[PDB]
Amino acid sequence: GMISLNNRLTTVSRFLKQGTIADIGSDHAYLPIYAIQNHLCECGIAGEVIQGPFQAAVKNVAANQLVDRIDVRLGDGLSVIQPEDVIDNITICGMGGPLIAKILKDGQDKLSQHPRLILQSNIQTENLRQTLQQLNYEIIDEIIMEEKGHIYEIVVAEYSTELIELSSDELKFGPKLLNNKNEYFIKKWQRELEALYHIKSKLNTEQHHQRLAQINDEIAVIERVL
């Protein structure tokens, strides 16, 4: 029947443009299946990095009668993208910011048709914003939201004919999310402060001068924005 997604991925789906979705490291092709069942996209590519998710995606596409509309591919990151593909959206979800960043940078040659990027980061989204900036991408929307008590960020970006430089605060906190600072922004960064002060409970100041200087600088950045 109709697939139901979690709220994190449902929220991602609301940023899809019409056409093709390429879901990278897909969670068993459910986001592409949902997108087609709901008429958000026409066609899909589901990239799966290892055999288990690959085999599951193949079975799920077949079970939903979408074998002619979603192409399930085995490969890491953007390695699955083929030269003849027409891709309107690349989605990369359920990963840390640093991994999404690495996928985009390592795969940058696959971005020539300038698709919309919809990235859903679990942690440390700074790295992905730094990479987007390097790739002539511009953040056009951001969401911060909570599901099952965990806070997730969604970053929506499109290609710009000039590189868009972000400040240190915009990279760390988000150029859109800074404009709003919703209850989930405050909760996320309160939690991150608690984690940084907790690290200070574990590191002797005589033995960790360099590392503690970095932690204290980061605390001061967050305390200024809250």
Residue numbers in the entry: 0 to 225
Direct quotes from the study:
SaTrmK is typical of class-I methyltransferases, with an N-terminal domain where the cofactor binds and methyl transfer takes place and a C-terminal domain likely involved in tRNA recognition.
Intriguingly, citrate could be fitted perfectly into the electron density, making polar contacts with the side chains of His27, Tyr29, and Asn59. It is possible the negatively charged groups of citrate are mimicking the phosphate group(s) of tRNA. DSF analysis indicated that citrate leads to an overall modest decrease in SaTrmK Tm that only becomes noticeable at high citrate concentrations, which is incompatible with the presumed tight binding required for the interaction to continue from protein expression to crystallization. In the absence of tRNA, SaTrmK contributes no background luminescence, as expected since the enzyme is not purified bound to SAH. This is evidenced by the crystal structure of the apoenzyme and no SAH detected by LC-MS after denaturation of SaTrmK which would have released any bound SAH.
